[PDB]
Design an enzyme around this catalytic site. Structure first.
Site, PDB file in Angstrom:
ATOM      1  CE  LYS A 242      96.623  31.759 -69.277  1.00  0.00           C
ATOM      2  NZ  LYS A 242      97.523  30.560 -69.131  1.00  0.00           N
TER       3      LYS A 242
ATOM      4  CE  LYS B 148     101.221  31.524 -71.385  1.00  0.00           C
ATOM      5  NZ  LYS B 148     101.743  30.117 -71.387  1.00  0.00           N
ATOM      6  NE  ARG B 149      91.029  32.139 -74.189  1.00  0.00           N
ATOM      7  CZ  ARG B 149      89.743  31.865 -73.969  1.00  0.00           C
ATOM      8  NH1 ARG B 149      89.290  30.619 -74.081  1.00  0.00           N
ATOM      9  NH2 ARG B 149      88.908  32.844 -73.635  1.00  0.00           N
TER      10      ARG B 149
ATOM     11  CG  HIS C  63      91.992  22.946 -62.629  1.00  0.00           C
ATOM     12  ND1 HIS C  63      92.847  22.146 -63.357  1.00  0.00           N
ATOM     13  CD2 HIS C  63      90.947  22.159 -62.278  1.00  0.00           C
ATOM     14  CE1 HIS C  63      92.345  20.926 -63.433  1.00  0.00           C
ATOM     15  NE2 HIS C  63      91.191  20.909 -62.789  1.00  0.00           N
TER      16      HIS C  63
ATOM     17  CE  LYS D 182      99.544  21.369 -74.444  1.00  0.00           C
ATOM     18  NZ  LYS D 182      98.422  22.227 -74.938  1.00  0.00           N
TER      19      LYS D 182
ATOM     20  CB  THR E 295      99.484  21.667 -69.834  1.00  0.00           C
ATOM     21  OG1 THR E 295      98.483  22.472 -70.463  1.00  0.00           O
ATOM     22  CG2 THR E 295      98.960  21.134 -68.508  1.00  0.00           C
TER      23      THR E 295
HETATM   24  O1  LIG Z   1      95.203  22.202 -64.626  1.00  0.00           O
HETATM   25  C1  LIG Z   1      95.180  22.468 -66.035  1.00  0.00           C
HETATM   26  C2  LIG Z   1      95.363  23.969 -66.288  1.00  0.00           C
HETATM   27  O2  LIG Z   1      94.156  24.635 -65.837  1.00  0.00           O
HETATM   28  C3  LIG Z   1      94.206  26.036 -66.232  1.00  0.00           C
HETATM   29  N1  LIG Z   1      92.814  26.541 -66.201  1.00  0.00           N
HETATM   30  C4  LIG Z   1      92.036  26.882 -65.169  1.00  0.00           C
HETATM   31  C5  LIG Z   1      90.873  27.247 -65.725  1.00  0.00           C
HETATM   32  C6  LIG Z   1      89.700  27.706 -65.109  1.00  0.00           C
HETATM   33  C7  LIG Z   1      89.650  27.944 -63.731  1.00  0.00           C
HETATM   34  C8  LIG Z   1      88.471  28.405 -63.136  1.00  0.00           C
HETATM   35  C9  LIG Z   1      87.330  28.629 -63.909  1.00  0.00           C
HETATM   36  C10 LIG Z   1      86.152  29.093 -63.311  1.00  0.00           C
HETATM   37  C11 LIG Z   1      85.011  29.318 -64.086  1.00  0.00           C
HETATM   38  C12 LIG Z   1      85.050  29.079 -65.463  1.00  0.00           C
HETATM   39  C13 LIG Z   1      86.227  28.619 -66.066  1.00  0.00           C
HETATM   40  C14 LIG Z   1      87.369  28.393 -65.288  1.00  0.00           C
HETATM   41  C15 LIG Z   1      88.551  27.934 -65.880  1.00  0.00           C
HETATM   42  N2  LIG Z   1      91.045  27.079 -67.039  1.00  0.00           N
HETATM   43  N3  LIG Z   1      92.187  26.665 -67.259  1.00  0.00           N
HETATM   44  C16 LIG Z   1      95.265  26.699 -65.330  1.00  0.00           C
HETATM   45  O3  LIG Z   1      95.254  28.118 -65.515  1.00  0.00           O
HETATM   46  C17 LIG Z   1      96.659  26.100 -65.634  1.00  0.00           C
HETATM   47  O4  LIG Z   1      97.640  26.590 -64.708  1.00  0.00           O
HETATM   48  C18 LIG Z   1      96.623  24.555 -65.587  1.00  0.00           C
HETATM   49  O5  LIG Z   1      97.790  24.033 -66.218  1.00  0.00           O
END
Ligand SMILES: OC[C@H]1O[C@@H](n2cc(-c3ccc4ccccc4c3)nn2)[C@H](O)[C@@H](O)[C@@H]1O
Length: 810
Positions: free
Chosen positions: A548, A542-543, A351, A654, A650
């Site tokens: 971002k 978003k976060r 991800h 939306k 995502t």
């Molecule tokens: O696939 C679903 C979505 O995932 C998002 N994402 C990635 C993470 C993430 C990645 C690595 C991590 C490692 C340790 C703890 C939390 C983490 C969260 N959280 N959200 C991605 O940033 C986004 O691009 C994507 O649409």
């Protein structure tokens, strides 16, 4: 009221009313004279819940008789939001409940607002798991979501003096009517201890035991009578724990802390022992449950034929050596056979490509906590590296690059390398992201085993993200093309033949205006803030993260403000700029960015010369329930990550589904969205991935942009001198310094094109008819981005099972 919300039959309404009254009396122990809105909510929730149970028992009975291959989706996050309306929608109960409550003298929408979000996730990764569960049930797959039941989810965000404050999300305070505790299926999980070697193999001994107690939540499919299960584990101390007396009982909290709180980090790795314990806890309990269910159908050759395990990022990566441990140490299978089974069972989804987000666990941590798993990891590594050496003889640097063990000051295990080695499939979450994986960070692995690497572009459920949050739009669409699109979103293409339909154009624009009015009223009623509903609703939710680029948005906002101050009596398209999202508690820069946004608002919103032409609002406590409100109301969706950094996104999808136009970089799923709608119907700007690469080779110099762009220079000088913070003139020094000297994400590099593109947005908005026609072209081509499509691809290409739209008998 409206078609898509189902039938309100005389029999159903009567039955709903009496069961509502039964629950109020028998379940809540109240009468109508003392009942509060909260009591009414719970009576409704219990009434709807009753409709799930028959279907839930019969679905699980069906799986036992038919014995299909089971899908286990392992995640540390499930960002579920509210459940009441979703359940009504999927069961075709919404209009009936609406009627039943009306006749009891209650407003159902008011009751819906009482439900707490189940906030067991941080953002995109957690929400994807939730959308996925919905689609798996809708597609009739024998699927189970496995995770942790956190006592405290993602914190509630308060803004005090422009600063983020965190408070505990005590979401279970009033109880959770949707879950069913299953104490009878409690399983033991082991920690610490040591490894003994005998004649009959290795044994893991002298361990500390924590109990895992499951709680089950039903997951209803869309009108197919399928109800799947999300099982979340809760930590419990054993009864002989520490067993002066009082302290021993009080010390039980230590064991139970495992499931206490969600780590609040988005796209960032924090290497803490408590987090590692959470990761093993979920994995150990889940695998025992899987194997138990498999045995209740000796021969583990059929294991991969009956079980698929999907790893949501590397967080549950310990499933790989834990499965090996069980098969080798407990079932007494030989290594090679156990490994074959493991590989064929596991698949891994990545991800992110950000280096700080990759899990790399210190060896000394695994040595103390999970001594047997470390031994297994070393053995996996040795055998894997022997394969690399054989395929690429003499390539010594490849060996060190591909090793699961990283050498250095502290030795670490690369969990991503572990996952690739032990999975039959590795996927990224959008086409450009999956290509980046093969070309850059996992290039060596792609060269060794190209067959493993796949793409599965993300999606969102059209149930929550259209029907639920935007009934007005769902209805006007249904009027023309019927209801079948709700579980076959590709049918939205039929809307292209309505792009010159004058009635449809008017209706699409009407639904948006209604959404904007409703949201403008929400902001006054709940936060006492004034906005102009005729302005362009420019939203970035978003976060908060540097990648971002909320900061790039900030720069545009200030540019617009400065241009108004320069030519006050010149016409500009009015905008309401809305920015929201949570910052991780320890992420200093992200907290500073929030303060900047509010600081800009404090200047802009109170300048009389501006009037109501420009408003900057920070949307407090952004979460699933707030997304459902703001997204239908949006005109412009900000998707402006530096190219190559947002794996998919995502939120973007939306907004597309709900009638907002997109301003964005060619990043993540934006690329495929533009491809689907046509580039002419998207506001694309900025560097492509290749341009970022070229800039890196040359070296990014921010001063260059500062020197050559007078409008940008003005903003920096304003920030430095204390224009946006008169009492504390140097408040934003960290931000300016970062932008000027160490900006990993090249904010300045995209500034000119961004501002130019924003002018094109304002121009189109001046022509309501052509704005709306472009909107229709977006909505009409958003079909690819249904998670039904995404899950169908996983099913066929990874899990080896066929989706089914066939109803189970009611
Ligand atoms: O696939 C679903 C979505 O995932 C998002 N994402 C990635 C993470 C993430 C990645 C690595 C991590 C490692 C340790 C703890 C939390 C983490 C969260 N959280 N959200 C991605 O940033 C986004 O691009 C994507 O649409």
């Amino acid at each position: 009221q409206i078609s898509v919300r189902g039938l309100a039959g005389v029999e159903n309404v009567t039955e709903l009313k009496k069961n509502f009254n039964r629950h109020l009396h028998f379940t809540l122990v109240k009468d109508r004279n003392v009942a509060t809105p909260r009591d009414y909510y719970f009576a409704l929730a219990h009434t709807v819940r009753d409709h799930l149970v028959g279907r839930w028992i019969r679905t699980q009975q069906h799986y036992y008789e038919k014995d299909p291959k089971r899908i286990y989706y392992l995640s540390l996050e499930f960002y579920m939001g509210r459940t009441l309306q979703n359940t009504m929608v999927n069961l075709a109960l919404e209009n009936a409940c609406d009627e039943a409550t009306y006749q009891l003298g209650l407003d159902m929408e008011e009751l819906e607002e009482i439900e707490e979000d189940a906030g067991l996730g941080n953002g995109g990764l957690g929400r994807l798991a939730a959308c996925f569960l919905d689609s798996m049930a809708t597609l009739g797959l024998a699927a189970y979501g496995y995770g942790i039941r956190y006592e405290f989810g993602i914190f509630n965000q308060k803004i005090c003096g422009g600063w983020q404050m965190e408070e505990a999300d005590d979401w279970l305070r009033y109880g959770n009517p949707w879950e069913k505790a299953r104490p009878e299926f409690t399983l033991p999980v082991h920690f610490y201890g040591r490894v003994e070697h005998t004649s009959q193999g290795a044994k893991w001994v002298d361990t500390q035991v924590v109990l895992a107690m499951p709680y089950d939540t039903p997951v209803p499919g869309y009108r197919n009578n399928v109800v799947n299960t999300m099982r979340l584990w809760s930590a419990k101390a054993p009864n002989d724990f520490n067993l002066g007396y009082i302290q021993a009982v009080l010390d039980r909290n230590l064991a139970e802390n495992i499931s206490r709180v969600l780590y609040p980090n988005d796209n960032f790795f924090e290497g803490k022992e408590l987090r590692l314990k959470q990761e093993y806890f979920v994995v150990a309990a889940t695998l025992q449950d899987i194997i138990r269910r498999f045995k209740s159908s000796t021969n583990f050759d059929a294991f991969p034929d009956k079980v698929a395990i999907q790893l949501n990022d590397t967080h549950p990566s310990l499933a790989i050596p834990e499965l090996m441990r069980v098969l080798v140490d407990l079932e007494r299978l030989d290594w090679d056979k156990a490994w074959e089974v493991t590989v064929k069972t596991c698949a891994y989804t990545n991800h992110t490509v950000l280096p700080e987000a990759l899990e790399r666990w210190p060896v000394h941590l695994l040595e103390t906590l999970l001594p047997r798993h470390l031994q297994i990891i070393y053995e996996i590594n040795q055998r894997f590296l022997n394969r690399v050496a054989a395929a690429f003889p003499g390539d010594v640097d490849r060996l060190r690059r591909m090793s699961l063990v990283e050498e250095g000051a502290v030795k670490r295990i690369n969990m991503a390398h572990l996952c690739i080695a032990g999975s039959h499939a590795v996927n990224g979450v959008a086409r450009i992201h999956s290509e980046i994986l093969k070309k850059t960070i996992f290039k060596d692995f792609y060269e060794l085993e190209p067959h493993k690497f796949q793409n599965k572009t993300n999606g969102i459920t059209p149930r929550r993200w259209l029907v639920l949050c935007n009934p007005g739009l769902a209805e006007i669409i249904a009027e023309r093309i019927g209801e079948e699109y709700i579980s076959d979103l590709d049918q939205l293409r039929k809307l292209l033949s309505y792009v010159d339909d004058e009635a449809f154009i008017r209706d699409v624009a009407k639904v948006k205006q209604e959404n904007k009015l409703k949201f403008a009223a929400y902001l006054e009623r709940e936060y006492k803030v004034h906005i102009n509903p005729n302005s362009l609703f420019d939203v970035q939710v978003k976060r908060i993260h540097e990648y971002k680029r909320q900061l790039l948005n900030c720069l545009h906002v200030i540019t617009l403000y400065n241009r108004i101050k320069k030519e006050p009596n010149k016409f500009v398209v009015p905008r309401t700029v809305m920015i929201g999202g949570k910052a991780a508690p320890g992420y200093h820069m992200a907290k500073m960015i929030i303060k900047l946004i509010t600081a800009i608002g404090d200047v802009v919103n109170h300048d009389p010369v501006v009037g109501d032409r420009l408003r900057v609002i920070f949307l407090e406590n952004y979460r699933v329930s707030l997304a459902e409100k703001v997204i239908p109301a949006a005109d412009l969706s900000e998707q402006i990550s530096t190219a190559g950094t947002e794996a998919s996104g995502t939120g973007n999808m939306k907004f597309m589904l709900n009638g907002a136009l997109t301003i964005g970089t060619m990043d993540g799923a934006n690329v495929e969205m533009a491809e689907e709608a046509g580039e002419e119907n998207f506001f694309i700007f900025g560097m492509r991935v290749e341009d970022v690469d070229r800039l890196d080779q040359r070296g990014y110099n921010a001063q260059e942009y500062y020197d050559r762009i007078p409008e940008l220079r003005q903003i920096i000088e304003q920030l430095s001198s204390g224009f946006f913070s008169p009492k504390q003139p140097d408040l934003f020094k960290d931000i300016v310094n970062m932008l000027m000297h160490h900006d990993r994400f090249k904010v300045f590099a995209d500034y000119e094109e961004y501002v130019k593109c924003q002018e094109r947005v304002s121009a189109l908005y001046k022509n309501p008819r052509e704005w709306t026609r472009m909107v229709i072209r977006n909505i009409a081509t958003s079909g690819k981005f249904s998670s039904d499509r995404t899950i169908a691809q996983y099913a066929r290409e990874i899990w080896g099972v066929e989706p089914s739209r066939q109803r189970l008998p009611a």
